[PDB]
Amino acid sequence: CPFGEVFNATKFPSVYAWERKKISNCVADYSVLYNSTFFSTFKCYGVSATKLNDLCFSNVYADSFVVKGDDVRQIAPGQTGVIADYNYKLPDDFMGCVLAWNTRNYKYRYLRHGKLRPFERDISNVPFSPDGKPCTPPALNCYWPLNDYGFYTTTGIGYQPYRVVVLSFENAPATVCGP
Amino acid sequence: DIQLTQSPDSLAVSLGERATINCKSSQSVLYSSINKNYLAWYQQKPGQPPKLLIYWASTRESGVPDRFSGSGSGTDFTLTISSLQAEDVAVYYCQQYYSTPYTFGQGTKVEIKRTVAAPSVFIFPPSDEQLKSGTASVVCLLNNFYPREAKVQWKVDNALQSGNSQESVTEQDSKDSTYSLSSTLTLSKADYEKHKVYACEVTHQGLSSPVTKSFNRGEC
Amino acid sequence: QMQLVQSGTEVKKPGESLKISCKGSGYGFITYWIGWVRQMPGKGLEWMGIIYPGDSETRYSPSFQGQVTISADKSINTAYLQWSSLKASDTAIYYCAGGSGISTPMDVWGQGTTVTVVSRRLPPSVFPLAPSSKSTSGGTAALGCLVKDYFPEPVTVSWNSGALTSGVHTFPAVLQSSGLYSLSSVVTVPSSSLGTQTYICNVNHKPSNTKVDKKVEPKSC
Ligand SMILES: *[C@@H]1O[C@H](CO)[C@@H](O[C@@H]2O[C@H](CO)[C@@H](O)[C@H](O)[C@H]2NC(C)=O)[C@H](O)[C@H]1NC(C)=O
Ligand SMILES: *[C@@H]1O[C@H](CO)[C@@H](O)[C@H](O)[C@H]1NC(C)=O
């Protein structure tokens, strides 16, 4: 039901600090996403989109963020990019939907000690040392990990912003179903 | 990666009985979280694209009648058609959509066992247009019979012919489960000119006596 | 619900390029992945590959990697299958099917594209199989057409331009030792109506770019 304020949200977090939503206590009609001629991509893994109304889950969870359009390809299981490693990683056996649409009408982490777990998040802004030293403020070998996109109306559609919502699904009596 | 093998190659079932088809994978196709096997069953009737019948190994596509039923788990699955009907004559395949690359089973042709039906026999003399070819093709037609095994013997002046006839059978009819057969004797214009009576002698299980349809060159 | 329509029949010579298309139309298209399946005459189904037209992510089967290329274009909702140079082994029917996601069954199928690649082409000859008392048993007459000495398969034969289908039997062609093909298309009708009805067989052999309409009239006999 409340997708009207998840896909139609005034603004969105950006990818280092994405976060979820619940569809509990609902009945869901996913056609408001089937019949949406404005979605740039609609990539579901492990479940057929047009029969999602057939199914029943306990909860649905939607992660919301904003990526450069050329990295939409890496919100997907088993990808390799900076966004997939330090900001938002999808599981190998992931099942769910990645929806991306144009937002031309926001920061991202690019330095971290190791890769993220699937569905894990890193919110800290602490100076980065390439080999593990506590970095004294703006000295040497010191870099803050987070970093902005700096989107403008006038340049490449790949370099334009894109809003991305990732739906994942689910025991007990299922609480959200289709009509 | 994931290789599917179904059994048997063919199976013939009477109308109303049950047709079962096994599918065996080389590696499990269960996603443990949602607890559904990623296996589908498709039907292909002659001359048409395949049709998705079952997915998740037990869920029917919308519009599929209730007599189609999927079951199984892990590595072994079965498709069962209850209340077998004539229009269910087709080839059935299993398919895994667990991993890419996707894989089909090699396919199982389902045939019908029905009650005996005696053939209607007809014979066609060569056209005169083809008699300008230098070739004569005499054609004999067995229509809408069961079972499939029939014998067609060509006689020319009561001499039994061997080495100049070709037979072709149709797919099993989807409305009445019968077959049709065509036997064509091909001769020179000269050797056809030489002889007088041409006879198609049909022997079949539904015929008390061998039935013969014959004509005489020049009668038409 | 959404439909899939593929391009028409293709007859090519060994060694030329070919790009067959598959256009989808209907609500909810952007969720669909388009896969390609090859069916050689008399064989089963072979999965070739799959593509998502949204970003043209494509996955190939190990047996088709590099041998053909799968393409897409989201401008016109169209997937493509391409050979740069055809082999005689590539003669088949090619279906495009569609799954609402990846690792899903194939919900929607295309009507199929027949692709024939062959060296020589020889047009068929069509002769009437006229009905008579010899071709009549009871109150049921039989007539037909005999399509002989053609190469290669297939010939498509209709009756009265598609208007007469019930009681028709088009036999699988046989292979004459000359190397050429031959089949017969028969139909049973009421014998009483043989004066008032007209029965025309249509034979189209695309490889030789031929069509012929033969009126089959009855003989006294
Ligand atoms: C998306 O559009 C389709 C088709 O345009 C809608 O299909 C409806 O299907 C129901 C049941 O078959 C019919 O009663 C309606 O009349 C159809 N509507 C139309 C416009 O044809 C489908 O429901 C739509 N999904 C949404 C956005 O709800
Ligand atoms: C969002 O806004 C669009 C604008 O038409 C509307 O059609 C849609 O129902 C709204 N809700 C969702 C879930 O997108």
Numbering used by the authors:
A (entry chain F): 323 to 427, 438 to 502, 505 to 513
B (entry chain L): 1 to 27, 27A, 27B, 27C, 27D, 27E, 27F, 28 to 214
C (entry chain H): 1 to 52, 52A, 53 to 82, 82A, 82B, 82C, 83 to 100, 100A, ...
Sentences from the paper on this structure:
We further determined the x-ray structure of SARS-CoV RBD in complex with CR3022 to 2.7 Å resolution. The overall structure of CR3022 in complex with SARS-CoV RBD is similar to that with SARS-CoV-2 RBD (Cα RMSD of 0.5 Å for 343 residues in the RBD and Fab variable domain, cf. Fig S2A and S2B of). Nonetheless, the CR3022 elbow angles, which are distant from the antibody-antigen interface, differ in the two structures, as we mutated the elbow region (as described in) of CR3022 to promote crystallization with SARS-CoV RBD. The conserved binding mode of CR3022 to SARS-CoV-2 RBD and SARS-CoV RBD indicates that the difference in binding affinity of CR3022 between SARS-CoV-2 RBD and SARS-CoV RBD is therefore due only to a very subtle structural difference. The RBDs have a Cα RMSD of only 0.6 Å (0.7 Å for CR3022 epitope residues). At residue 384, the backbone of SARS-CoV-2 is further from CR3022, as compared to that of SARS-CoV. This difference in backbone positioning (~1.3 Å shift) affects the interaction of the RBD with CR3022 VH S96, which is encoded by IGHD3-10 gene segment on CDR H3. While CR3022 VH S96 forms a hydrogen bond (H-bond) with the T385 side chain in both SARS-CoV-2 RBD and SARS-CoV RBD, it can form a second H-bond with the backbone amide of T385 in SARS-CoV RBD, but not SARS-CoV-2 RBD. Consequently, VH S96 can make an intramolecular H-bond with VH T31 when CR3022 binds to SARS-CoV RBD, but not to SARS-CoV-2. In summary, VH S96 forms three H-bonds when CR3022 binds to SARS-CoV RBD, as compared to only one when CR3022 binds to SARS-CoV-2 RBD.
The major antigen of coronavirus is the spike (S) glycoprotein, which is expressed as a homotrimer on the virus surface. Since the S protein is essential for virus entry through engaging the host receptor and mediating virus-host membrane fusion, many antibodies to the S protein are neutralizing. CR3022 was previously isolated from a SARS survivor and neutralizes SARS-CoV, CR3022 was recently found to also be a cross-reactive antibody that can bind to both SARS-CoV-2 and SARS-CoV. Our recent crystal structure demonstrated that CR3022 targets a highly conserved cryptic epitope on the receptor binding domain (RBD) of the S protein.
